[PDB]
């Protein structure tokens, strides 16, 4: 049994099932189609959610290409739109990837 524990928002409960795709199902943790079985989900408002705000979880928003399934992603290289290099402070076509 490979138990994977992670916290996701309550709007993306539908995509966790095998087969579906999206911004979360292909950029961060893609589930193979041949995945036999299901998942376990429950609310965590009383445990993780806080009135003062919780900022302990993150996920990828931009990628050069779709990653290989079940291959861990660790490196957090910055992303750019134009071909001109950007460094120092923000500017034109220079945005924070995450």
């Amino acid at each position: 049994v490979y138990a994977d524990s992670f916290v996701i928002r309550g709007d993306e409960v539908r995509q966790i099932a095998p087969g579906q795709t999206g911004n979360i199902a292909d950029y961060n943790y893609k589930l193979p189609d041949d995945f036999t079985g299901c998942v376990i989900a429950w609310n965590s408002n009383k445990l993780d959610s806080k009135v003062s705000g919780n900022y302990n979880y993150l996920y990828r928003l931009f990628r050069k290409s779709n990653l290989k399934p079940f291959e861990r992603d660790i490196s957090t290289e910055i992303y750019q739109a134009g071909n001109k290099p950007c460094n120092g402070v923000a500017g034109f076509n220079c945005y924070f990837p995450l």
Partner: antibody
Amino acid sequence: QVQLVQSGAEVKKPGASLKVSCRASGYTFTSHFIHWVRQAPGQGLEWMGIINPSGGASYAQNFRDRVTMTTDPSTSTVYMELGSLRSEDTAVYYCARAEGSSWLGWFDPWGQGTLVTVSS
Amino acid sequence: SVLTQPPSASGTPGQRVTIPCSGSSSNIGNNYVYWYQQLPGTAPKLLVYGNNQRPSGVPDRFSVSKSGTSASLAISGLRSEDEADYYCAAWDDGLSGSGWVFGGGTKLTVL
């Protein structure tokens, strides 16, 4: 004495703003959350806003983008500014407090309440 | 106004007074129920919390029970001074917003 003091709403003019100061006495400010309660005449209790003793805040869903509300851990006082007055203001407001852990907590302190009436 | 509360209650003298507080499973079935007694012109006060522990100095003449997704308050030996206001408090999740929505208010009349 352990009491939360808030000034009542006075008469004003269209285009002006109402300032209400809520001050906690008898206990440390950074020990209880600050909560807003509304009660209309012949009606139950409604709640608007939350201000933590030290942290962020939760505004009013209905009264958003036009109510100024913040915190200041210097004089243990908070200030609420109201603009664009309307006849819906006629109620009594409680600047109350709750437990230090929210959710399942005891509402040990209560406020006297401010009577707000707007009419033309 | 999702919650429903009787406008008033009537009954012959010498009969036990039963008040039903019924809602959903999110606020009563899945959450604890708070029982408040509110005096006319006075801020509400918490009297019953958690259905298991009670504050000291409260006589046991009042009784409270929870069945299914509802609760019942039973008072035996009604007196003339029992005319007050009673509030149910629980955590509810609303489409517009989720929070602590209280009741409207119950008024009793004695002839």
